[PDB]
Amino acid sequence: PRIDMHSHFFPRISEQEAAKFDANHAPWLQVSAGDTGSIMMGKNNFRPVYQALWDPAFRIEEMDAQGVDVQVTCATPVMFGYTWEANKAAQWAERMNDFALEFAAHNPQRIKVLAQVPLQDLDLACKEASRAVAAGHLGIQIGNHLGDKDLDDATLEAFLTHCANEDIPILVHPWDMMGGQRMKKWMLPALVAMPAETQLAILSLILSGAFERIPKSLKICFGHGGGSFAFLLGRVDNAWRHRDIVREDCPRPPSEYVDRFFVDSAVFNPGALELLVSVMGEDRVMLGSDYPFPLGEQKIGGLVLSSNLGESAKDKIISGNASKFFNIN
Amino acid sequence: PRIDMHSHFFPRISEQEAAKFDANHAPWLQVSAGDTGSIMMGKNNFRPVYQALWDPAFRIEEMDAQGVDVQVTCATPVMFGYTWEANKAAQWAERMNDFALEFAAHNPQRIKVLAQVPLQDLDLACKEASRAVAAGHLGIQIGNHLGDKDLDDATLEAFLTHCANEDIPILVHPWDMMGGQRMKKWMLPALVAMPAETQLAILSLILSGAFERIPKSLKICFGHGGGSFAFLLGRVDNAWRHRDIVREDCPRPPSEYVDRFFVDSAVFNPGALELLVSVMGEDRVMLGSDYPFPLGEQKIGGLVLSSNLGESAKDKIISGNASKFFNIN
Ligand SMILES: [Zn+2]
Ligand SMILES: [Zn+2]
């Protein structure tokens, strides 16, 4: 069996549907050619997309071709709405999470969905998380930060702890990338800022001592192999050993906390995957493709399948780990 | 023989010396206890430092203890002065580069120095680079960016090309880190922003096509193992294969340009070093410690010496590569 736990969808939202929330910032889908289409914002074009992003039937055909039995899918991060007024964002989140379940309803045995939450208000976010999971979502996908609040911020740690106590799994996705006016060309935000964003989120939890407070029951996974986290961990441990301000809130070597989280396998390179599995363990890396975006893996699972990891490790990564992490059969 | 090509010094600058340039932004050294001291700016304390940073005699004692035969050293990046008026910055650069040669004069067989340049004015920077090297410097150390100008910017590429045509080697050091108002605690700028800064500098050259224009004669090295560059290269190659805007200026797979630059070995982890050498080749990684700072390597060369790389590879990394790169015996 083969599970892909990192992929995205975008629902068939009309311009008028979106305008009832926000004419300028609520995204919607314009479908033409329906082979091609575009995530729209207001009247401006936001991003060109193709049919698998919005069409569960077409998607199942590609999944069959790729040999993917079960795909876990979740919002495109442009849908997050973290800057909106909280109550409007919560209404948006519930509408998007209902759309997701409608997408999955096409074939709920093979399409699983994770939900978004109005993270700018802890109470509303906790309530939508429980509501979405009760309605059929297998967990939540959040952005890695909320403006200048990183995951060490008590509000975000409290959302994680809520999910832990309710056995709700979390996928953390980089979004709203740092960088200012730099990285204008060649998709540098996706190549530089995204992996740094995810590393920052992981280190924000470790170095703030959040894992000393969050129950071990938390199931939390970081996208894109955890960014650069695994490769730069030796530098973190060395800093921790030599500067008291790095130890202030983190009572043991930072690298020891890798038993508290998961990463997907999307590192697009054999040696990077081997290092990732070295650092994280064969039990904490899960096949994820970033389907259907261009910077995802074209042959889903190809990197893991063609690796020199043992047959046992390949089975956990392509199926066993996500089956346990998301409660899939 | 053993060469450490990444280390820093700070000269015995008095408050009045610095005030003749800028009472508020020119750094200086306050030496007390002389065991301890502090890089000062204006009347405010900037960073606590210890004696090896400013004392060549004391430094030689530690080098003897560590088994370091030759150390290459260069400005502490707070000395760069890239925001200053250009002519004042050029006068500062020449004074700092003279101090560096005075530091090295204590034992020029075992202490080599690289120079700083007033990078905010290409003509003055090119002139100081040639002048410093003529006076005895073995190359130049620059910051990785100049404000919102990264290394793809024609002015910085032109400085690199000048050095290439004059056989002047370059060390590129992360500095003035991205991140805005985030990363306030646990030295996250050094752990997250610095490796991303260096990755951004390397990718700025590759993805802009600068290596198609800069002569192959350029000898250029990136600090801290090149940041996260080597681990995230598979993600870059995949993006390049699937988005035309990533290929616009870079006519072949980005990973093929690793034969155009060097990195130091300071990745503080055995598996990271093995991956680094895999990506870069045993001929393009050089032992560097970041001495004498806390986030440097305590036992200089310990990671390389205790590795499972071949005896031949260990010899290139700890001695042969830098001997050739800097023209040392
Ligand atoms: Zn994604
Ligand atoms: Zn340094």
Side-chain angles (χ1 to χ4, degrees):
Chain A
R2 266 196 223 164
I3 303 172
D4 174 13
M5 47 66 62
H6 182 165
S7 78
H8 298 282
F9 87 110
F10 190 95
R12 303 192 179 258
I13 305 159
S14 69
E15 177 169 4
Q16 320 99 285
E17 265 178 285
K20 304 213 291 203
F21 285 88
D22 188 297
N24 295 121
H25 310 114
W28 59 279
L29 179 67
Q30 194 168 71
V31 165
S32 35
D35 310 32
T36 183
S38 304
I39 300 176
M40 201 77 21
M41 209 149 326
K43 276 132 193 323
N44 311 290
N45 184 98
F46 175 86
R47 187 211 272 227
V49 301
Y50 87 91
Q51 180 179 358
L53 187 70
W54 72 77
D55 189 335
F58 184 69
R59 184 184 288 213
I60 287 276
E61 280 335 289
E62 288 198 337
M63 293 180 47
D64 285 338
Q66 298 263 348
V68 175
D69 297 307
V70 180
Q71 188 172 79
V72 177
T73 201
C74 60
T76 305
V78 68
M79 300 163 49
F80 280 162
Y82 286 177
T83 57
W84 302 5
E85 187 273 323
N87 282 309
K88 183 199 291 175
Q91 302 181 36
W92 181 255
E94 178 167 5
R95 182 85 164 268
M96 298 302 106
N97 295 336
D98 288 336
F99 278 143
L101 286 164
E102 295 162 21
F103 192 90
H106 182 91
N107 195 335
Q109 294 85 19
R110 291 185 64 198
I111 308 183
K112 315 297 191 187
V113 289
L114 322 176
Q116 70 195 75
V117 294
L119 211 54
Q120 60 266 66
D121 182 280
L122 176 68
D123 190 81
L124 296 168
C126 288
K127 279 172 177 41
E128 178 63 22
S130 310
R131 183 206 77 73
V133 173
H137 282 260
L138 301 199
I140 312 300
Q141 178 205 209
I142 57 172
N144 71 293
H145 71 115
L146 185 74
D148 292 327
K149 287 176 180 52
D150 277 287
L151 286 184
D152 65 299
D153 188 280
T155 293
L156 301 182
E157 181 191 322
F159 176 71
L160 302 203
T161 300
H162 170 77
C163 288
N165 285 325
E166 284 210 7
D167 297 300
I168 297 176
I170 299 184
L171 174 59
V172 176
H173 196 291
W175 91 304
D176 182 26
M177 260 61 66
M178 69 180 75
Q181 290 317 290
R182 294 161 68 198
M183 304 186 242
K184 296 289 191 166
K185 300 183 82 170
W186 318 295
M187 306 203 316
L188 284 165
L191 308 177
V192 176
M194 273 173 76
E197 282 291 346
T198 296
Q199 183 204 16
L200 176 51
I202 294 178
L203 295 187
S204 291
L205 290 175
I206 294 172
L207 292 177
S208 68
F211 286 127
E212 297 296 321
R213 304 178 288 279
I214 299 170
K216 286 171 182 274
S217 57
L218 178 64
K219 291 183 183 194
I220 183 161
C221 182
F222 293 88
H224 308 131
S228 48
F229 162 75
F231 182 80
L232 305 171
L233 185 50
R235 179 179 180 74
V236 175
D237 271 359
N238 187 66
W240 182 97
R241 286 190 309 276
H242 291 105
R243 285 294 273 111
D244 55 348
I245 65 175
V246 185
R247 295 178 215 118
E248 184 185 87
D249 304 291
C250 177
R252 57 196 300 165
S255 56
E256 294 183 0
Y257 291 96
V258 297
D259 67 350
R260 299 297 311 279
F261 58 95
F262 293 68
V263 300
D264 73 41
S265 68
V267 296
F268 301 96
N269 175 267
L273 178 62
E274 278 166 20
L275 191 149
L276 190 58
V277 172
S278 188
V279 172
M280 297 299 301
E282 58 179 37
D283 297 301
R284 298 181 169 271
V285 178
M286 293 184 285
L287 169 58
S289 61
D290 221 9
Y291 175 92
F293 290 135
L295 263 53
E297 188 184 19
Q298 163 62 204
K299 323 303 200 215
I300 296 163
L303 184 78
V304 173
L305 292 183
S306 76
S307 78
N308 295 334
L309 306 172
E311 182 207 21
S312 169
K314 288 159 159 190
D315 283 348
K316 302 178 160 179
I317 290 158
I318 75 191
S319 160
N321 291 343
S323 158
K324 180 178 175 36
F325 183 100
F326 292 102
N327 198 20
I328 308 173
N329 285 33
Chain B
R2 266 196 223 164
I3 303 172
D4 174 13
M5 47 66 62
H6 182 165
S7 78
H8 298 282
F9 87 110
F10 190 95
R12 303 192 179 258
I13 305 159
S14 69
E15 177 169 4
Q16 320 99 285
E17 265 178 285
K20 304 213 291 203
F21 285 88
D22 188 297
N24 295 121
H25 310 114
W28 59 279
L29 179 67
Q30 194 168 71
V31 165
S32 35
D35 310 32
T36 183
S38 304
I39 300 176
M40 201 77 21
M41 209 149 326
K43 276 132 193 323
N44 311 290
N45 184 98
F46 175 86
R47 187 211 272 227
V49 301
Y50 87 91
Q51 180 179 358
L53 187 70
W54 72 77
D55 189 335
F58 184 69
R59 184 184 288 213
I60 287 276
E61 280 335 289
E62 288 198 337
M63 293 180 47
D64 285 338
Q66 298 263 348
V68 175
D69 297 307
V70 180
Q71 188 172 79
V72 177
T73 201
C74 60
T76 305
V78 68
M79 300 163 49
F80 280 162
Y82 286 177
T83 57
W84 302 5
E85 187 273 323
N87 282 309
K88 183 199 291 175
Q91 302 181 36
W92 181 255
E94 178 167 5
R95 182 85 164 268
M96 298 302 106
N97 295 336
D98 288 336
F99 278 143
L101 286 164
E102 295 162 21
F103 192 90
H106 182 91
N107 195 335
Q109 294 85 19
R110 291 185 64 198
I111 308 183
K112 315 297 191 187
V113 289
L114 322 176
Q116 70 195 75
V117 294
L119 211 54
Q120 60 266 66
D121 182 280
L122 176 68
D123 190 81
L124 296 168
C126 288
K127 279 172 177 41
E128 178 63 22
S130 310
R131 183 206 77 73
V133 173
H137 282 260
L138 301 199
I140 312 300
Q141 178 205 209
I142 57 172
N144 71 293
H145 71 115
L146 185 74
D148 292 327
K149 287 176 180 52
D150 277 287
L151 286 184
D152 65 299
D153 188 280
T155 293
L156 301 182
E157 181 191 322
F159 176 71
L160 302 203
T161 300
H162 170 77
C163 288
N165 285 325
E166 284 210 7
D167 297 300
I168 297 176
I170 299 184
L171 174 59
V172 176
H173 196 291
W175 91 304
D176 182 26
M177 260 61 66
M178 69 180 75
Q181 290 317 290
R182 294 161 68 198
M183 304 186 242
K184 296 289 191 166
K185 300 183 82 170
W186 318 295
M187 306 203 316
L188 284 165
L191 308 177
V192 176
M194 273 173 76
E197 282 291 346
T198 296
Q199 183 204 16
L200 176 51
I202 294 178
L203 295 187
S204 291
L205 290 175
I206 294 172
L207 292 177
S208 68
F211 286 127
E212 297 296 321
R213 304 178 288 279
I214 299 170
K216 286 171 182 274
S217 57
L218 178 64
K219 291 183 183 194
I220 183 161
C221 182
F222 293 88
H224 308 131
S228 48
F229 162 75
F231 182 80
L232 305 171
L233 185 50
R235 179 179 180 74
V236 175
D237 271 359
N238 187 66
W240 182 97
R241 286 190 309 276
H242 291 105
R243 285 294 273 111
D244 55 348
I245 65 175
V246 185
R247 295 178 215 118
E248 184 185 87
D249 304 291
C250 177
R252 57 196 300 165
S255 56
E256 294 183 0
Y257 291 96
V258 297
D259 67 350
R260 299 297 311 279
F261 58 95
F262 293 68
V263 300
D264 73 41
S265 68
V267 296
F268 301 96
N269 175 267
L273 178 62
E274 278 166 20
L275 191 149
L276 190 58
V277 172
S278 188
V279 172
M280 297 299 301
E282 58 179 37
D283 297 301
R284 298 181 169 271
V285 178
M286 293 184 285
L287 169 58
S289 61
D290 221 9
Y291 175 92
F293 290 135
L295 263 53
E297 188 184 19
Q298 163 62 204
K299 323 303 200 215
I300 296 163
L303 184 78
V304 173
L305 292 183
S306 76
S307 78
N308 295 334
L309 306 172
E311 182 207 21
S312 169
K314 288 159 159 190
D315 283 348
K316 302 178 160 179
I317 290 158
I318 75 191
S319 160
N321 291 343
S323 158
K324 180 178 175 36
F325 183 100
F326 292 102
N327 198 20
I328 308 173
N329 285 33

